[PDB]
Structure 1
Amino acid sequence: SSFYTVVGVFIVVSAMSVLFWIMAPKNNQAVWRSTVILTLAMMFLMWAITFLCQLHPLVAPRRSDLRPEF
């Protein structure tokens, strides 16, 4: 859609990160917080990169082997 899709997904992921930081289990709390929040950060970052590279692409797919029926 646009960069605002990335911004909205970031808002959702940040809300989840804050609520998990608040609601992290007491046992291994630092482990839970670091693992989950950093996992969310890396997953979202790589999704956002993949989404942005395709948002306004400068190169379009080109091929000479696609059958016309498909």
Structure 2
Amino acid sequence: SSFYTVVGVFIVVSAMSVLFWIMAPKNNQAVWRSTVILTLAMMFLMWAITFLCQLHPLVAPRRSDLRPE
């Protein structure tokens, strides 16, 4: 059904977030460590909602006028 595309990109983003948890600089530790891991999650979730419900659509476009070329 290619829901596994969403699953695989989720695996990649979660893996790089766990990679960033053990990488973030020691100066403002919680600020980097929280801002980056919480922006990767939301930028993923919005795209994953976008790719779904365009996968198996129930409504098709119409466009009545549409020049024949």
Fold match (TM-score > 0.5): yes
Alpha-carbon distance in 2 for matches of 1:16, 1:50: 21
Cα distance, 1:19 vs structure 2? 0.6
Q: Residue 53 of structure 1: CA displacement?
A: 1.5
TM-score in terms of structure 1 length = 0.90
When the two chains are superposed, the root-mean-square deviation of aligned CA atoms in Å is 1.2
Residue 5 of structure 1: aligned partner: 5
Note the residue ranges of structure 1 that are not aligned, 5 or more in a row.
Answer: none
Q: Which has the higher contact order (CA 8 A, sep 6+)?
A: 1
1:40 to partner: Cα distance: 0.5
Give the deviation of 1:65 after TM superposition.
2.2
Structure 2 Cα separation of the partners of residues 22 and 65 of structure 1: 57
Percent of counterpart pairs with the same letter?
100
Paired residues in the alignment total 69
Residues 28-56 of structure 1 deviation map (CA, whole Å, 9 limit, x = unaligned) = 11111111011000000000000002011
Q: Which runs of 4+ in 1 moved over 2 A?
A: none
Structure 2: segments with no counterpart, 5+ residues: none
